[PDB]
Amino acid sequence: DGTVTIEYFNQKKEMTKTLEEITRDFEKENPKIKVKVVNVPNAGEVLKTRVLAGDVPDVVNIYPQSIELQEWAKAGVFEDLSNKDYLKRVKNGYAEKYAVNEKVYNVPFTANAYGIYYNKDKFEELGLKVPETWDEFEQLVKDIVAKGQTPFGIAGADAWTLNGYNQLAFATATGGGKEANQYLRYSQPNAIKLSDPIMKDDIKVMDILRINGSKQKNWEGAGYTDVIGAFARGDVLMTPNGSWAITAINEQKPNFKIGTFMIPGKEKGQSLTVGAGDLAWSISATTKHPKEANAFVEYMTRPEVMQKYYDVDGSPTAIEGVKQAGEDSPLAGMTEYAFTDRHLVWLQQYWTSEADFHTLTMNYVLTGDKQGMVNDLNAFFNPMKA
Numbered sequence: 130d131g132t133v134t135i136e137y138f139n140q141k142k143e144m145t146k147t148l149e150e151i152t153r154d155f156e157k158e159n160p161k162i163k164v165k166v167v168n169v170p171n172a173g174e175v176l177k178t179r180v181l182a183g184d185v186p187d188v189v190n191i192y193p194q195s196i197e198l199q200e201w202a203k204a205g206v207f208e209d210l211s212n213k214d215y216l217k218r219v220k221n222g223y224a225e226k227y228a229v230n231e232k233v234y235n236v237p238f239t240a241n242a243y244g245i246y247y248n249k250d251k252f253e254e255l256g257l258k259v260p261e262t263w264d265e266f267e268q269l270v271k272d273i274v275a276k277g278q279t280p281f282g283i284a285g286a287d288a289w290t291l292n293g294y295n296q297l298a299f300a301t302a303t304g305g306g307k308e309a310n311q312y313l314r315y316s317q318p319n320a321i322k323l324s325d326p327i328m329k330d331d332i333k334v335m336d337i338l339r340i341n342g343s344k345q346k347n348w349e350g351a352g353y354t355d356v357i358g359a360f361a362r363g364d365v366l367m368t369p370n371g372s373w374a375i376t377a378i379n380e381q382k383p384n385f386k387i388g389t390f391m392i393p394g395k396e397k398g399q400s401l402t403v404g405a406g407d408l409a410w411s412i413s414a415t416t417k418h419p420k421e422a423n424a425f426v427e428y429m430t431r432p433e434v435m436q437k438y439y440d441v442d443g444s445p446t447a448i449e450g451v452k453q454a455g456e457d458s459p460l461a462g463m464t465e466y467a468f469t470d471r472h473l474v475w476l477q478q479y480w481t482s483e484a485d486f487h488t489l490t491m492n493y494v495l496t497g498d499k500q501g502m503v504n505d506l507n508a509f510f511n512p513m514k515a
């Protein structure tokens with residue numbers, strides 16, 4: 130044949146079209162290299178299945194904060210990338226941030242963030258402003274309801290959409306990422322109580338989604354795609370989601386200017402965001418073609434290649450020589466403190482899982498069971514403390 134075939138296991142399902150075009154550009158420059166792009170649903174679970182099966186894809190899209198990356202790096206599943214030349218194209222010391230045993234096993238090209246998408250046009254129409262406190266965010270929702278408009282679009286069927294919301298609910302209440310994990314993860318068993326002021330603050334922030342008439346009709350069984358469309362059409366004024374959503378929203382061709390804002394704290398200037406490596410690649414240590422796999426990763430570190438991805442995606446990049454958008458862009462408010470302290474890492478960096486945290490978050494929006502949520506939190510965190 131002559132040509133060799135490497136596999137790229139993608140999790141960026143929103144960026145399927147652009148990543149394939151970049152792949153074709155690579156294939157045209159490398160005639161002896163063919164790249165198969167894999168896009169399967171529930172890619173995170175399929176990856177667990179494949180790694181254990183010993184069928185590790187050549188290039189793997191894996192989130193570098195995950196416990197999966199940490200465990201598999203120590204096991205020797207991934208190639209050491211510490212002394213690669215293309216790693217010098219990663220600024221903000223972002224590759225070093227997710228080092229395992231002081232060794233880099235992942236190239237995080239982009240960083241995701243979390244906030245609230247909002248309709249700038251209808252905000253101007255109704256004379257609404259971006260909230261700076263919990264109380265203001267409560268009022269904003271109530272003001273929208275009274276105007277006969279739906280504030281939030283919530284994906285009840287996809288609990289992972291509110292992961293960033295609840296994590297920031299704890300973050301803004303406690304002080305930051307470390308402070309949130311001190312209350313939740315590194316506390317004593319059965320420490321989380323309803324009487325705890327931090328918990329009372331958490332409920333308050335979560336109750337913003339529980340305000341009368343805050344959510345759209347038939348939200349309980351609404352998916353991630355459903356809410357993207359609902360926001361794009363202008364059926365809902367806001368939707369809480371990650372920076373990964375904007376490319377899907379843009380594709381729906383909305384007839385309004387899109388904006389974002391961070392989930393605020395108790396008082397002004399206490400707003401935070403959460404995220405980690407979005408487009409983040411690792412190379413299999415057991416690959417038959419390590420030179421070809423490295424050439425694919427190196428290709429993505431190129432500024433003119435990364436620009437092509439960024440122009441569609443929009444999430445902040447750590448790649449050198451990429452012209453990024455200004456404060457006029459949709460993700461301006463959400464990614465305002467990108468690559469700073471106020472951009473804390475996903476809390477599941479020090480958890481054994483996160484799936485149940487999604488469930489108990491959404492379950493509260495469904496039921497409003499305060500004690501039930503507290504019980505869910507203890508049942509989730511206790512096994513980790515043991």
Ligand SMILES: OC[C@H]1O[C@H](OC[C@H]2O[C@H](OC[C@H]3O[C@H](OC[C@H]4O[C@H](O[C@]5(CO)O[C@H](CO)[C@@H](O)[C@@H]5O)[C@H](O)[C@@H](O)[C@@H]4O)[C@H](O)[C@@H](O)[C@H]3O)[C@H](O)[C@@H](O)[C@H]2O)[C@H](O)[C@@H](O)[C@H]1O
Binds near residue numbers: 143289
């Ligand atoms: O906060 C969420 C997320 O943020 C970071 O990752 C960035 C990532 O975010 C999105 O993708 C999220 C997630 O998508 C997949 O998982 C979806 C769920 O899959 C299962 O659920 C079911 C059960 O059959 O499967 C289908 C989904 O196709 C659903 O019908 C049904 O709910 C699973 O049970 C559940 O736990 C999952 O949430 C994927 O497998 C994951 O790896 C993730 O990618 C964006 O779409 C994507 O572009 C990225 O930007 C962070 O790193 C994550 O840890 C997490 O915290």
